[PDB]
Amino acid sequence: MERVNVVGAGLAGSEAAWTLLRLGVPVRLFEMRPKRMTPAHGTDRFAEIVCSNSLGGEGETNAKGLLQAEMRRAGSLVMEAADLARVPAGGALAVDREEFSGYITERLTGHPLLEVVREEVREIPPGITVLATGPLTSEALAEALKRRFGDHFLAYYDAASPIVLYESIDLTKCFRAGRYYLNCPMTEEEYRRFHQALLEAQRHTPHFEACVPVEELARRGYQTLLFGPMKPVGLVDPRTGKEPFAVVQLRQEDKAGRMWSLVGFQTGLKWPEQKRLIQMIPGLENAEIVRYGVMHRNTYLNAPRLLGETLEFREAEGLYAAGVLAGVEGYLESAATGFLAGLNAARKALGLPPVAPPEESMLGGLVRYLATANPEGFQPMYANWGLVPPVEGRMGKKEKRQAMYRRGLEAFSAWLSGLNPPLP
Ligand SMILES: Cc1cc2nc3c(=O)[nH]c(=O)nc-3n(C[C@H](O)[C@H](O)[C@H](O)COP(=O)(O)OP(=O)(O)OC[C@H]3O[C@@H](n4cnc5c(N)ncnc54)[C@H](O)[C@@H]3O)c2cc1C
Ligand SMILES: N[C@@H](CCC(=O)N[C@@H](CS)C(=O)NCC(=O)O)C(=O)O
Ligand SMILES: [Mg+2]
């Protein structure tokens, strides 16, 4: 029988396959494990959880909590598995990893319309196909993607800097300018405090070579950051009429301008340390960090250059990407993009046009960011409140988040209800 190809049976591919199957579209699910393992995997199971067993905070104040709720409403297999494999984790949804992957593997393998092929896919399959090969996408397939779409549009590591919410910046301590960006000028004493704090800050341990984490630049000498990302070259501080001693620059990442990254602040610091350090920067004393910096091995595509919000390749009809390969980060985000890619692939198989959830929903905010974010040096994205529209008002952050949760979940549910054919 004719089948939609799903390449990779991780978080994204498992959900993509389930979505296709639910809509009555047969699937050919390729998985190279166990005979070819990635450096992080150890089993033959679909949707193996390779690290932490947390799927994110569940609260109505948590962006991941909204995405969890949306995925339940969608009938996600990953959420079913998580709900059944739930273990205690202080506010987070966390799972017994073996019960989680076991349930997913059983439900998929037992479906009459699923064929499993245990092989490494080395070339882009023809026909309707979802690619979901993850952060450790095999070398051969990565090479195939570079050949087809361009060497510069696939990355092997992320090197993300922190991103803050624009409204949380104190603009009285910044100036907008390009050399000769938002610029946060610093005095020599402020730089010295910041540099010293970087020397001692707690950092994660690796499991890049000209891309050096800022905390490591600090360790390589007092001058290093001043020659690098904190250089004031070509800038004039309107307050002094002179070149500032040092600056931190921020650049706009999203179309809406809610999300601004610290330029050149790639980092492997622990997240609480990043927050402490960031709030030492003039203008950022009360900054809300919506995406923390990270430095790791991570194969992914330039989503804004290559993908629509539908997760279909702009220049390859009926080809889709999901999961980390598509430019997201996180087990849940990967499953959720798998759902959407599978939905659109199923619709394609049925001769129907693709869909995408609304901007108010977390999944919608995420995929719309993938399609429209700044393409230059594009880095992966996880679920956060910067991705959806604000809730206007002067209520506190907790309340705004609760309002965003309710609004988003309702918007997502209405979107689901409008789908034809419906998810049964
Ligand atoms: C070391 C490490 C730790 C992580 N820790 C966390 C964490 O704590 N929390 C979190 O939310 N996320 C974590 N992730 C990030 C990410 O959310 C997970 O990697 C998540 O599983 C991504 O889902 P995915 O479906 O995109 O990829 P995966 O789940 O990795 O699935 C990809 C699948 O494709 C297969 N494959 C690859 N190439 C081919 C090929 N050419 N042919 C056939 N099959 C192929 C792989 O064997 C794999 O089964 C971690 C990732 C890594 C690498
Ligand atoms: N990860 C992508 C995007 C580019 C990238 O990661 N650049 C780094 C170089 S050190 C960067 O500046 N990170 C900090 C930031 O994005 O501001 C790539 O390998 O092509
Ligand atoms: Mg960046």
Question: What atom of ligand 1 comes closest to residue 332's alpha carbon?
Answer: 11
Total number of domains constituting the chain:
2
Strand 163-165 vs strand 259-262: parallel, antiparallel, or unpaired? antiparallel
Residue 124 beta carbon below 6 angstroms from any ligand 1 atom? no
Q: How far is the CA of 342 from the centre of ligand 1 (A)?
A: 17
Residue 81 and residue 93 share a domain: yes
Residue 98 and residue 74 share a domain: yes
Residue 147 and residue 9 share a domain: yes
- For residue 317, give the CATH number of its domain: 3.50.50.60
* Distances, alpha carbon 100 to alpha carbons 14, 197, 391, in Å: 12, 41, 35
Report the DSSP beta bridge partners of residue 4: 27
Residue 167 and residue 79 share a domain: no
Residue 249 and residue 236 share a domain: yes
Residue ranges lining ligand 2, Cβ < 6 Å: 155, 157-161, 211, 261, 263-266, 377, 379
d(C-alpha 203, C-alpha 271), whole Å: 9
Ligand 2, atom 19: nearest CA belongs to which residue? 155
Residue 93 in tokens = 């949804």
Of 257, 279, 298, the one marking the end of a domain is: 298
d(C-alpha 66, C-alpha 257), whole Å: 22
Of 249, 266, 298, the one marking the end of a domain is: 298
Residue 177 and residue 322 share a domain: no
- This structure was determined by X-ray
Residue 134 and residue 6 share a domain: yes
DSSP symbols for 339-363: HHHHHHHHHHHTT-------TTSHH
- Domain boundaries, position 221: 156-298
Residue 205 and residue 100 share a domain: no
| Resolution as reported, in Å | 1.0
Residue 347 and residue 330 share a domain: yes
Mutate to test the pocket of ligand 2, among 266, 296, 302 (most ligand atoms within 8 A of CB): 266
Return the closest-CA partner of residue 342 out of 148, 56, 155, 71: 71
DSSP symbols for 91-148: TEEEE-HHHHHHHHHHHHHT-TTEEEE-S---SPPSSSEEE---TT--HHHHHHHHHH
d(C-alpha 337, C-alpha 31), whole Å: 18
The residue written with tokens 């604000």 in the block is 390
Tell me the CB-side half-sphere exposure of residue 230, using CA atoms within 13 A.
Answer: 23
Mutate to test the pocket of ligand 2, among 149, 151, 161, 211 (most ligand atoms within 8 A of CB): 211
Residue 228 and residue 249 share a domain: yes
Residue 241 falls in which region: left (phi positive, over 0), alpha (psi -120 to 50) or beta: left
Of 248, 276, 298, the one marking the end of a domain is: 298
Q: Which residues contact 110 (CB under 8 A, 6 or more apart)?
A: none
The residue written with tokens 């995997």 in the block is 41
Q: How far is the CA of 61 from the centre of ligand 2 (A)?
A: 30
- Residue 413 φ/ψ, nearest 5 degrees: -65, -40
Residue 273 and residue 198 share a domain: yes
Residue type at 161 in one-letter notation: S
> Residue 132 CB: number of other CB atoms within 10 A?
32
Instruction: Find out whether 387 and 378 touch, Cβ atoms under 8 Å.
Output: no
Asked, as a colleague might, if the bond just before 34 is cis with ω within 30 of 0, I would say yes
Angle separating helix axes 97-109 and 11-22, nearest 10 degrees: 40
Instruction: Find out whether 49 and 100 touch, Cβ atoms under 8 Å.
Output: yes
Residue 409 and residue 339 share a domain: yes
